[PDB]
A paper describes a structure:
The NTD is implicated in the binding and melting of regulatory elements required for transcription initiation, whereas the CTD drives protein dimerization and is thought to contribute to the binding of the RNA packaging signal (PS) sequence during virus particle assembly.
Each protomer in the structures is comprised of five α-helices, two 310 (η) helices and two antiparallel β-strands. This region—which is flanked by Lys256 and Lys257 from both protomers in a CTD dimer and further composed by Lys259, Lys261 and Arg262—is thought to contribute to RNA binding.
Author numbering:
A (entry chain AAA), B (entry chain CCC): 256 to 364
Write the structure that this text describes.
Amino acid sequence: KKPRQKRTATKAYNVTQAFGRRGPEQTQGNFGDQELIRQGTDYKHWPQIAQFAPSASAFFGMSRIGMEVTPSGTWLTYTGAIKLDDKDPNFKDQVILLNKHIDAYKTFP
Amino acid sequence: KKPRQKRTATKAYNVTQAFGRRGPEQTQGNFGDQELIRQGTDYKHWPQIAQFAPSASAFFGMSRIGMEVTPSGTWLTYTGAIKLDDKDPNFKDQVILLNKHIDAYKTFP
């Protein structure tokens, strides 16, 4: 189907199916509690997470972009940081929501 | 206008105006030669670059997401990698196009 970076997780094709298991390794995603993992973009608070994701123009404009070649193939690398607005009246709710998903897999039964 | 991560660069609002000057530091973008800097999404080969940009779902599914509280504010950190298809006949040209823009800023004021 679609290249991995263009996939959209849903209830029918979830975060694990599209992007693999959450874990600690540099190759793994770490974001998502059990609800977000099974629902993807169907998750009730998805829009509040998607407001932090970069447009294509911002992805290539804000990030440090590189190319790394490994035994698995050729990779476009990306790093960066998005500053939350502490004058956003939703700031405190945004922190709480991001805190619920970052490394949430560590607590899974 | 838009938050930084949702901005769209164009000739009318360019990569420097939207995302700041290219540079070597951690929250400095390093991507784009003078033509892409000037034109943003009006760049003639923008679709060949944007094919590698992640969906919101993939950005939060693939990336390693962190939160840092520093003297400057609260930051959402992100790292990851997007696999190129080395079997795509277009692979060689994709690599040339990306490398044209990665760290181009080092060659001009």
